[PDB]
Amino acid sequence: SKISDNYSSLLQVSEALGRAGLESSNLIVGIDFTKSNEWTGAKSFNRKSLHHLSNTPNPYEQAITIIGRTLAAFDEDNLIPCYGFGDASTHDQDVFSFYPEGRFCNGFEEVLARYREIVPQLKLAGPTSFAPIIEMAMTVVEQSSGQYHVLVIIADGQVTRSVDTEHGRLSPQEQKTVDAIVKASTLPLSIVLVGVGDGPWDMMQEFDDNIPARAFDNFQFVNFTEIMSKNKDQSRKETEFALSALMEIPPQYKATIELNLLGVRNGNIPQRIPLPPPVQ
């Protein structure tokens, strides 16, 4: 069933996790390197590309940074597998690992550094689909034998569609993304979409709230731009981010126990191989 916003403060989330008795969790990060990032910073990033490097941190650097300051404790060994998708080497079919032999980033400081080192070497492309990043996460979970994971996807939310959809019919990219979300729910995996840039966010909100075929609500949408836009203190910004990102985690974690997913091998999860980073 659909999971609502049941907590009005970070403290309530923490207590809910306390009651549920969470003992162990790990993070997975996926980063959208599709071409739409060049134009979804029109209003929110002064007509620059969301991936543009300079003296000001771009929204991806900001999200990675805030994620590291607020969610780091939810990765138990501070080793974070990072993947990119949607550049010219992966299109809508594959992901690549941040490092050549699948070596994990040691801390989000290194996630941020490696991001900076990689992104100007990429050809931003497409089409845009979340199926490969989610399928990657599924393989990480299956290979750990059903250890609980949270996949954090940082993206601009522009999954490929036709503007004159006729009407409510999904693109292949949307349909494959939905199928991946539905299949993911046979595994102990939480997904958090951190939306950067201008939106629009209709489809992310649909992933969040309305996929009847899945076994539990396994997908939360965080509007990162709207949180950072609020004329409000920086510590209150990060607290509001943490709250939004963790909002569904206590019920999702509980669902993995009640649906007998936690610690169990599914047996029907194809092994996705990440491509090497297309870099020097």
Of 36, 6, 22, nearest to 156 by C-alpha is: 36
Q: Does 36 bind Mg ion (CB under 5 A)?
A: yes
SS3 16: helix
Quote the DSSP letter at residue 213. Answer: T
Position among 208, 211, 253, 272 found at the interface with Ca ion (CB under 5 A)? 208
Residue 96 or 104 having the CB closest to Mg ion:
96
Are the C-beta atoms of residues 30 and 83 closer than 8 Å to each other? yes
* Dist CA 81 CA 160 (whole Å): 25
* Dist CA 165 CA 159 (whole Å): 13
Residue 106 or 260 having the CB closest to Ca ion:
106
Cβ partners under 8 Å of residue 11, min gap 6: none
Q: How far is the CB of 156 from Mg ion (least distance, A)?
A: 6
Q: Which of residues 1-20 bind Ca ion (CB under 5 A)?
A: 3
Cα 127 to its chain centre, rounded Å, is: 17
Task: Give the range of 34-42, 48-56, 137-145, 186-194 binding Mg ion by CB under 5 A.
Answer: 34-42
x-marked contacts with Ca ion along 89-128 as a string, rule CB under 5 A: ----------------------------------------
Q: Does 87 bind Ca ion (CB under 5 A)?
A: no
Residue 40 or 190 having the CB closest to Ca ion:
190
Are the C-beta atoms of residues 131 and 105 closer than 8 Å to each other? no
Residue 36 or 252 having the CB closest to Mg ion:
36
Binding site for Ca ion (CB under 5 A): 3, 26, 75, 77, 79, 208, 217, 219-220
Binding site for Mg ion (CB under 5 A): 34, 36, 128, 158
